[PDB]
Design a protein around this ligand. Sequence first.
Ligand SMILES: *[C@@H]1O[C@H](CO)[C@@H](O)[C@H](O)[C@H]1NC(C)=O
Lengths: 30, 50
Amino acid sequence: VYMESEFRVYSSANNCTFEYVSQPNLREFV
Amino acid sequence: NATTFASVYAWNRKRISNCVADYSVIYNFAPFFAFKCYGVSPTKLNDLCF
Ligand SMILES: *[C@@H]1O[C@H](CO)[C@@H](O)[C@H](O)[C@H]1NC(C)=O
């Protein structure tokens, strides 16, 4: 980012079989 | 209910997922010239899951 005008994390596109959208000091994840 | 369909050589495909597959709303359109089903049964299509 130099807002958030770049998404070069991926290079191409494919099937895209699924998509989901929702809301996003210690934050644990499993 | 689309207003314009693509040609046969450039057929457009849409993906259906994460929704309630109510196939009964399809019958509200014009009488179908062909409704041949293979493997699946249109009578109890809503009973199965895919
Ligand atoms: C959907 O189908 C109806 C008839 O069943 C038609 O009058 C209507 O124009 C169609 N919708 C669109 C966006 O064309």
